[PDB]
Amino acid sequence: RCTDKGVESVFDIMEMEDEERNALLQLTDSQIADVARFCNRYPNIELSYEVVDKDSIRSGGPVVVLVQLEREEEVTGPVIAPLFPQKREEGWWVVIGDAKSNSLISIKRLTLQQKAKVKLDFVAPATGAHNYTLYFMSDAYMGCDQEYKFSVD
Structure with a gap:
């Protein structure tokens, strides 16, 4: 039903209203407790x-790209694991690479709980x-594949 309307993501659905969240398909009163x-x-x-x-960067010099990860909501609890057996805390990969050359430039794992800092150097x-290109990729959730393309030198 969502493919036959024009909507595919949860950011394509969470930008609706509560009635519009319910006027898309079926609903029950425990669904509104867990999905919210x-x-x-x-x-x-x-x-x-x-x-x-x-x-002012030339050939040879090691360069930095610093990432602050602005989380805009409170962390109350672990990841939702309804089919996964363990209580897992969420991780992150601040990873940078080559969108054409398929060359993994750098990557750092990350645990934040709020807006934290990560520095990563390369040559x-x-x-x-x-x-x-900078990617932000998690180990627990979809919809947050933030890639931002840029250039140096």
Whole structure:
């Protein structure tokens, strides 16, 4: 029913109203208890990224990209694991790479609980600018594949 209307994500559905959440398909009064706390408990984290010496970087020098992970909602409980047996705490991969060359530049795992910091350095080879892409990928939830493309040198 969602493919035959034009809606595919949960960000395509959570931007509706409560009646519009219920006027899409079927409903029952325990569904509104669990789906709403599911939407309460998934990661609502957006980005902040930072590069030093954008023009003033040359060949050889190690360069940083710093990521603050702006979480905009409170963490009350672990991940929703209705079919997974263990009580797991959520992790993160602040990972950067090459969208064309398929070259994994860097990656750091992350546990935050609120807006925290992650610095990651690497080395860029010669002949100028290299167009990197930053991904934010979790081990527990969909809908947060934030990739942001940029370039250095």
